[PDB]
Each structure stands twice: as C-alpha cells, then as structure tokens.
Design an enzyme around this catalytic site. Structure first.
Site, PDB file in Angstrom:
ATOM      1  N   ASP A 206      45.095  41.775  42.961  1.00 56.40           N
ATOM      2  CA  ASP A 206      45.626  41.567  41.619  1.00 56.40           C
ATOM      3  C   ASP A 206      44.570  40.864  40.768  1.00 56.40           C
ATOM      4  O   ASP A 206      43.726  40.177  41.315  1.00 56.40           O
ATOM      5  CB  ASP A 206      46.877  40.701  41.733  1.00 56.40           C
ATOM      6  N   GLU A 230      42.575  45.499  40.923  1.00 61.19           N
ATOM      7  CA  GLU A 230      43.191  45.727  39.604  1.00 61.19           C
ATOM      8  C   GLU A 230      42.262  45.078  38.579  1.00 61.19           C
ATOM      9  O   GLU A 230      42.225  43.841  38.437  1.00 61.19           O
ATOM     10  CB  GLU A 230      44.584  45.119  39.508  1.00 61.19           C
TER      11      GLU A 230
END
Ligand SMILES: *[C@@H]1O[C@H](CO)[C@@H](O)[C@H](O)[C@H]1NC(C)=O
Ligand SMILES: [Ca+2]
Length: 476
Positions: A206, A230
């Site tokens: 993330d 990400e």
C-alpha cells in the site's frame, strides 16, 4: 515466489470483510454506507476457493491482516485493514493465526498463490494531532517513531507526500518516520517473519509513493517474495521509476486510458494504444506490472456503464495485457458501486453464480491465457504489441510466433453492428485456422495473410491457432 514465478499468475483481489462469511450466508446484510464489519473471514475464503478457481485465477490478493483501531469512527470500522495499530497481532474479525495458515495451505493444495496487502507508511487512529496516544501503536509505541504531525496539502511536493500524514482530523494515519534505522529494521524484520509464518507467496504494498524510495529495496529483499506496489499516479514518468526499487507496481498508467477507452462508445482507443507503447518502452519491466480497471479506491467499471459488451472487452484486456491480470471481487458479477464506500460491496450478496456473463467471459479469457502459458514459456516475456486501432477498435498480439494470441477489442457496445474487420499484422500464415476462443468460432487467415475477423454485438475476439488447441479442453 519470485517475480519470474508471478509473471504467469492471474489475481483475484478481494476484501476479507466483504468476500465470504464463515456461515456461507448469501443474504447477510452488508450496507456499504454503514462502513462497518459485515463479517467476511479467512475461513469464508477457503470455502469459496472453487468459485474463484472456476474463473481460472491462480492467486488471490487479500486486504491487510494486522490488528486495527477498535473504534467505529465517524468513517466507520477498520473493516478494510488499512488502519493498523498492532502489527504483531492479527485482526480477530477475520479469524485466528491458524485460519490464515489454513488459507495459505488451502491455496497451496490447489496450486494457487497467496498475496497479502501490507502497509508500512502508517498506523491508524480515531482522532488526530494532540489526540494521538502513541502508546497504543505496537511496536511503535512512541511519538519518536513518527514524522511530526502535518497533513499532505501539496501533492506536487514529493517531500510533503513522504513526510506528512494521510487521513484528516477525523481519522488520522500517523506517518512512520521510515528514514529512521530502527523503523527500517523493525519493518524489515516484521515483513520477513510475516511471509515465513504464513507461507505468503507475494505482497501488495500500500501507499508506496508516501515512503521515500530508499526504504523499499530493503523491504522487498526482507520479504523474500515478489512485491507489487500501489503507486497511485497515472503518469508513467512518476510511477514506473518505482520499479527500480520494487519488483512491480499496479498499472495506474494504463488504468485511466483503459477505463476511458471502454466505459463509453466514444472512448479513445488512441490514448490506450499510446499508453501501452509508453509503458512498454519507458517502464523497467511492463511484464511485472498488475493490470486492472476496478479496485476499492475508484468507481467500479459498471458505475460508468452497464453495457455488458463493454465490461467483457475491458475484462479481456486485463487478462491478455502484459503483466499480471487483477480482477476485483464483484467485477465478475457486474457490481456497479461508485467511490468508497459504495465499491466495497459484499461478494456473497450476488449468490456467487458461476453462470453470470462476466464469470464465463473471465473463465474463457483466463483459460486461453493459462493454456497458452503452459505451451509457450515465452508468452509472459513477449511484450504486448498493439497492431491496429480505429475509432472503436484496438487489436493486440502477444506470444511466440506460431502460438501468439491475437485479441480484437471494441467499444461499439451491445448494439454494435455486424461487419468483417480485415486485420493485418497478426503474424499467422495464409490458410491457418484460428479459434475465436470466447465464442468458439473458427476464422481462417486469407491468402494475403490478413485475418477476416467477424465483428458483432460489440463482442471481444480472442484468436489462437486451432492446431495448437489439440488436447486442451477449450471450445470442445
Ligand atoms: C512469526 O512468528 C514468530 C514466533 O516464532 C514471532 O517471533 C514473530 O513476531 C512472528 N511474526 C509475525 C509477523 O507474525
Ligand atoms: Ca510517509
């Protein structure tokens, strides 16, 4: 598993809270607007592995597993996993350590991989600023492990993007000082031990752009597995350099033009064709990126258009593009929620039908991809080649000469007219029989080497040599 092991994979991305309950209910209430735990579990996932594998997926990506803030905040519960407080405890909402090990083992029995979402950038807290009791964070139980409190306001200032806090005054995401050796060493120890305790095959990381680049190579190395980051930016000149510090990144550069090309009958095939070529040339390795058009951070594809032909074409692209296809639980049931929390619909409320149009399309597309890869060790490293575009069409070729998949996609939609597209550049021989493996029709290459592709219903067309399908269970 290594980056090379992951190239041939196809990922089904799910929210643990939202995919499958232990009781298997297909009617348990899940009002997304409530933003509360709806009761999905790791055992729930195990029970529905036939549903996922039925679509020809080889891997799942699950949302983070660490223990969260306990509160129902003004923005709801930490049902999504992104608001961690104790990284050495599991989120008991989803089950026990034995349950998460049972899920890894269930996937492994079926020849599938487990990918787990992880956060290094931040913890979560119900409140902000002077309200934060840093003692609740384990093991980072002191203000000394965090960047000083400030919010990100200038997304153009990469220093503020890395050093300032995500979230807001309602739910803050206290930002770890990832430049500190103790924070690096703790995260590196943690991720290596997480991967080894749960036999995890890969990680989705993330908020990668919110952590300075020099953190990531040591993190990737300590994990010992493929990591896909990400990096939430559609500019390949921003996003693709992160591949110099991490194995892969989610293909946010392709996302925007891919969505635009297929969400309407007036979509730009030019912008998608151009981005495929930019990513192919300018990204360290396009074959280690993750292709997607739907996730939990944007409106679902069907929120833009309910045309099922358009959804079939965008799904076929995702499976047949360079890199690792990623389909978000609910996409295959044509879920149409908008932005968070509307796009966190429970998969179980569909009833998990295996006869839905998009379940069948995804199954056919993954079937030919999985088959072609089993026969052609070059498929996953042949960079996808856009060979044709017009106002409503893009055609691409991928795979070793004589075994290549040639894919013709359309944004005409379900009321599209019937016509023949004379396709040049497919690289097949005159008189060669090709199978269109979505509809199971035969197309023969012309004397001039052009493929007379039948177009109808706005449907995607996926071509592969008929004689290469000997012994496959495709279109029999
Ligand atoms: C892995 O298990 C060991 C117990 O052997 C423990 O030392 C470590 O904290 C665990 N790590 C994770 C992330 O669970
Ligand atoms: Ca940060």
């Amino acid at each position: 598993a290594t980056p090379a092991d992951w190239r041939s994979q196809s990922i089904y991305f799910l929210l643990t809270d939202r995919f499958a309950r232990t009781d298997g209910s297909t009617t348990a209430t899940c009002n997304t607007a409530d933003q509360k735990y709806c009761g999905g579990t790791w055992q729930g996932i195990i029970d529905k592995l036939d549903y996922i594998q039925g679509m020809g997926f080889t891997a799942i990506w699950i949302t983070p597993v660490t223990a969260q803030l306990p509160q129902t905040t003004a923005y709801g519960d930490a049902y999504h996993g992104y608001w961690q407080q104790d990284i050495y405890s599991l989120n008991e909402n989803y089950g026990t350590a034995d349950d998460l090990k049972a899920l890894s083992s269930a996937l492994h029995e079926r020849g599938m991989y487990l990918m787990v979402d992880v956060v290094a950038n931040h913890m979560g807290y119900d409140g902000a600023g002077s309200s934060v009791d840093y003692s609740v964070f384990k093991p980072f139980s002191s203000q000394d492990y965090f960047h000083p409190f400030c919010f990100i306001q200038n997304y153009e200032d990469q220093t503020q993007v890395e050093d300032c806090w995500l979230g807001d005054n309602t739910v803050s995401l206290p930002d770890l000082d990832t430049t500190k050796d103790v924070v690096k060493n703790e995260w590196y120890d943690w991720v290596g031990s997480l991967v080894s305790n749960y036999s995890i095959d890969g990680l989705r990381i993330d908020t990668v752009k919110h952590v300075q680049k020099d953190f990531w190579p040591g993190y990737n190395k300590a994990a010992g597995v493929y990591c896909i980051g990400e990096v939430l930016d559609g500019d390949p000149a921003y996003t693709c350099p992160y591949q110099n510090v991490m194995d892969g990144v989610l293909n946010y550069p392709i996302y925007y033009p891919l969505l635009n090309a297929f969400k309407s009958t007036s979509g730009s095939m030019d912008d998608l064709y151009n981005m495929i070529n930019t990513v192919k040339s300018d990204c360290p390795d396009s074959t280690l990126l993750g292709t997607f058009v739907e996730n939990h951070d944007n409106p679902r594809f069907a929120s833009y258009t309910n045309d099922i032909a358009l959804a079939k074409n965008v799904a076929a692209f995702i499976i047949l593009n360079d890199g690792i296809p990623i389909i978000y639980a609910g996409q295959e049931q044509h879920y149409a929620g908008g932005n968070d929390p509307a796009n966190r619909e429970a998969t179980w409320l569909s009833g998990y039908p295996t006869d839905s149009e998009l379940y069948k399309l995804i199954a056919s597309a993954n079937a030919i991809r999985n088959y072609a890869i089993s026969k052609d060790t070059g498929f996953v490293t042949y960079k996808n080649w856009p060979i044709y575009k017009d106002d409503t069409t893009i055609a691409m070729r991928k795979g070793t000469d004589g075994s290549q998949i040639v894919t013709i996609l359309s944004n005409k939609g379900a009321s599209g007219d019937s016509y023949t597209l004379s396709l040049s550049g497919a690289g097949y021989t005159a008189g060669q029989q090709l199978t269109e493996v979505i509809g199971c029709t035969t197309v023969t290459v012309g004397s001039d080497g052009n493929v007379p592709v039948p177009m109808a219903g706005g449907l995607p067309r996926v071509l592969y040599p008929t004689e290469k399908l000997a012994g496959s269970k495709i279109c029999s």
